[model samples]
Target chain A: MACTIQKAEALDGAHLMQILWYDEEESLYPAVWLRDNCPCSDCYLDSAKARKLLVEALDVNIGIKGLIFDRKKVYITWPDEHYSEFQADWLKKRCFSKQARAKLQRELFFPECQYWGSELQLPTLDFEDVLRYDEHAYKWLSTLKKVGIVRLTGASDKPGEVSKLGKRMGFLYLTFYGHTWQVQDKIDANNVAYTTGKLSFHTDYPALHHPPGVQLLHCIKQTVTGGDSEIVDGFNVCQKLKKNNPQAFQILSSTFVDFTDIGVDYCDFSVQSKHKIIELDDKGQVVRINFNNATRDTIFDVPVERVQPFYAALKEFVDLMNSKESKFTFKMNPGDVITFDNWRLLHGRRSYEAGTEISRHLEGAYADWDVVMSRLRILRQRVE
Target chain B: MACTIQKAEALDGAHLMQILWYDEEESLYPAVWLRDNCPCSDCYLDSAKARKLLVEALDVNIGIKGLIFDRKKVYITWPDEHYSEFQADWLKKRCFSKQARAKLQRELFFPECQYWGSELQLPTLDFEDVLRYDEHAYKWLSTLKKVGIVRLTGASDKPGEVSKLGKRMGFLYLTFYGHTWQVQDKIDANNVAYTTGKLSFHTDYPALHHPPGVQLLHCIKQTVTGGDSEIVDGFNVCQKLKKNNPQAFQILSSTFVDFTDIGVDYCDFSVQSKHKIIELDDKGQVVRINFNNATRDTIFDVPVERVQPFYAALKEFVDLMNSKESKFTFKMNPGDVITFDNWRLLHGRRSYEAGTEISRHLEGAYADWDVVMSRLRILRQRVE
Candidate 1:
């Protein structure tokens, strides 16, 4: 699976160990570095997986006492009479040669998006299928990773049942909104989610330095009328905006605005953070779209002259988000759970009448996309 | 309690409001910025401490309609008919003027030479005094802030009593080690703190990207003959190294070392981070000292040539830490609480004999200095 070690010798005043691989590339590692990283039973404790070596305990002038190379491994003895054996394949793959580094970077690497209208069908999955089969769970998570949103229609109708789905992946991210928060109309509402009002399409928790990557909302009760859930592929809208009006896109991406979540009572605390509406990666691909009308601070972080132009540009970009061609609307059922990427998906709800004996309740939770993607990869490997 | 507003007028094409204070300092604020930060009842909800304004809802072209300057405050009415009142003192302090900004930078800004040498008198405080009076709490916290460590006596000798002390300041920081961890010998020990062996002086959680700022350990029981706590001022050692051996200091400060917390069991996961031993701020002051020998990775993130010099410098620094003249050793008694800055102090313990029927249990927890300082300021304001 990797290149073989052709030659090994000390270099740079005998402080470094230089090895020539079969690929004709030489890589240098410090002698002390190798001695420090010995994976022997004495060097690393198997019970704790912690290194037993301290730099102060070693002699700075120490070098490789002896070395020998076999067909598949390299054995070395340090000045302290400690022996270490390293697999040639593992060391060759970790070579810091320019060619190896370049290949690693290229492989370690954008977004071609699929836009949908209101009539588009949702990507729906069954909870039983996901729970029973590893392949099914992997497929469901991978679909959610590729697409922005997914719907699980067979989840239990009981409150907090979505927590089981979160557990199936990893741990839930706890925010000021609680681990699993209830979304219902209340007189002491501190956020738009707690009110029976039309919330414009926006991502959740922009005030956090590292916001939750994904959000899942399970509908426990939805007896009310005109409360259809709305979702927009923020990445798709941003791509179109970048293509149609690069100036507005530039403004939205370059300028920052503050988002604040303040306390109403002592039960809640205050938080504020500043970020741009659209975030771009090194390749200039739209990575995230953050928009929340209720939490957006009135204080414009831009110069006063730019405020007028910013508002104009913002309105133009927002118009595309609100366009009928960009929205996908669905009325979530009692047993349905909707999961969406907080970075690429903007979710909202239409206003509904309250206190008519029509209960409208939901339980919402969040998790990181990195954790979910890792779990999907592990499950896929297990299935294979 | 504020200076009089001598004059107020729109400036720079009506984009900003320039105010001349009684001291003749001209402060200019953006019109949109002031409107967004208006602390009026309508603009800012008093009960929630949140602004009700959304950027899209406001007319960006709107300017100040009317302005009135009083002895202590300035009142303005916007073109949208929204009224706002600002405290003259608050605006003066937050002024974005060139002079004000310069002064702010200079004002918004460590180490121990008098080591006790194993015969030290601890800086102790009474727990009842700290709980009953704000002054006592302020003094105790400030001492810890200044000296890098402090001791609190007369606390309950029960398990979890340390949480009461942590609650008095702020919330405890949760980690893989848990919120309130016991420093006792355990059969399933996942960390060095749970072992009975001697530990070297080092900071806690170097594997964490942002380690806890402060640590609080309450001695619930200490009837053993050994296990006396030892602390060394890491900043002091760094400062001395910089002054005496500049080359060694430079090597230690510039080189990066990897620290890993790899889990052996399923409960604790693995984490790795690379950081310099000594981190300097913009002004070149030592900001953080990271030293955890057990967690330090054998992987050196430096050129092979620097390996020898780095190990030499590391040995010199560690020797200073182990010197009797630089250490403060104390046998912690029951009901004693010790709080230290994790960034400044390196703490460890002497080896103790296990299974001797002598109890030596301690409860430990962590909190951020940011939270502790903020709580102190709030308490000061309340006392005032």
Candidate 2:
């Protein structure tokens, strides 16, 4: 990607400096832009890489005083008697050509994702290995990014060990549920997850405008039966719907459903947000799924004619998600940890007997994708 | 316009349903999509205009049992014997065609805005009229929407009168600066607004992702010298920059500037957010302007070479804003109030002398556009 400047010249009257690259491609940059972005020691701070030039102190009408091209760099002198040097490769990376910018944007924001169903063996990492070996940690994080779900077994039994795991990845999100919450049967549970009832596949905190991206459950104790955890790749189900039932897919994608959680006597927190079940990017690719039956609002805000169809489509989507063909079910033992992309994976649990002297407890927390991806990249950079 | 259904038919094997409109235009609806969106009393609540049918309780495979077209509507019965009806105009509005969807999106999010400079006279509203007359309130709100700035005179000199004005439009926004802040000199002030120094034109709370859309400042007293208020239409400056120096405009739009207030010794609030000085919508129209020299962070997050050029562009923008041609300067009398679109207008004040036994107090608060616009539309419906 490194580029070599063949010639440099300024366009008269226009105050533009054109660069002729070794590849015979021409790129024009405004003279003021060149002068303003001068990479001189006097203009920029090295430690923070910050601009020291005050906006009020510079002139916009200033043009390039001179331009020269060496073997591997371009040199420019501003009318204000300031000199700057730029590596040809640097200029090439910042090429503003339509095709080049589009490629760069895609490279920066979009990562290829892998979808799975019950056929996928749960991606696992040994907690001790991740703690001891950096490579193991990097690989574990990478697996989580690609598959959207991962598990850690044989973790420390110490309280709040999940925080250590979270720190290794990124920061834990604080919500009304607190930093880390214990999931157990309560006489006045604010949420369905706190009771011993069968929980439907759902993402947590759908009412949040920007809901937590990832969720982690660290098993503290699990002797009870029928409390097995289940997951479904919502992306896989959507893809099937798109192929087999395009009508249902379109309805789910186009319509908005309200999700709300009004504060009950048990918890004094209220929130409401509306989102389509299937969220698609501009290019029509499925990006996210927002489905939570318990938090769904009673009111449907769409036209009356949309009611029957929206319901039918929504039902098919739910049925596809709950089908045994798509679910990846498992029971976690003490010292086991599970993490999943809350935006892409629907999670649930089976009902269990609460007072049979069979204890089942788990601590849960959330983290955003930005933090997780940031840590993953930094870890990769250090290891590489 | 009311729509009359002309004919209806179903595509065999494809599971597609087509409706031929009286206008000779053909529309296709999927069998599943139609079934899901049926407008039957059992499926939809007429009083609430909400969907009552549960998604899982319906059958997607059910074909249209029968299709009948009356002069004004289309009637259908499903294989499950469920009846439904649809108005042709309703279907037209919900058309998923590329052109139709784009038009709908633009109509929903983008409202045409009128830009102005110093030469323009301030749009003013009577305080009593807004409080007592619904039509007057409607006109004031509409003017705020079109111009993004308005003033009110002859208001009460009450301390919390600004909050009442905010309530008239929407809910008051609570910030680190508190609900209703006093804009005056303070011995130990956390923010620059409490100092006697000249304040630069800027938006409030740039650190917030969804910053308050509108701001209201109510003057209770004004006796100090050299504290005249200045206002600038940031959108006008941006448009001019885009037309005259597109290179500088692109640099300002593409580069991210860090705005941070890490709770100085005098302040106990910390926040950090990154944004371009100029924000643009997908259609390349100006949407927001974030400019605050006092709050801008020293961090240069862009590529090292971008530092110089970014500073140059930023300086040029600042110069244009400070130019006499763009600023609307005025001194407010007691019982006068001013409100503006914080996203598009920058407000500031000149340096004032303190300890002269002269009082200059102003109460300030914020409100979002959603509430203001909603109330305006409702008032219009009720009055017009």
Give the number of the best model, judged by DockQ: 1
How far out, in Å, is residue A121 in model 1? 9.6
Least accurate 10 contiguous residues by lDDT in model 2 chain B: B262-271
Task: Return the TM-score for each candidate structure.
Answer: 0.77, 0.59
The sequence of per-residue lDDT tens digits that candidate 1 reaches over residues B226-276 is 899999888887877888789889987877677767553322344555668
Tens digits of per-residue lDDT for model 2, B1-384: 225567777676535667676777766666665665666765544432333454465565666778877666668877767778877777766555556545644433336678888896899989889988888887787778788888999998779888777657645655556667888776655566765667767887675555668888998878657789999999999988888789989988877776655433311334556677898754678889877665665433454346557766787787788888888999988899898899999888888888855378888888765546545655666696
Candidate 1: C-alpha lDDT? 0.73
How many residue pairs clash in model 1? 0
Which CAPRI category fits model 2?
incorrect
Tell how far residue A61 is off in model 2, in angstroms.
11
> Chain A: TM-score in each candidate?
0.80, 0.86
lDDT of 2 by residue, A129-201 (tens): 8877889888887888789888999986546967877767655665556767888776555666766667777
> DockQ (C-alpha) of model 1?
0.26
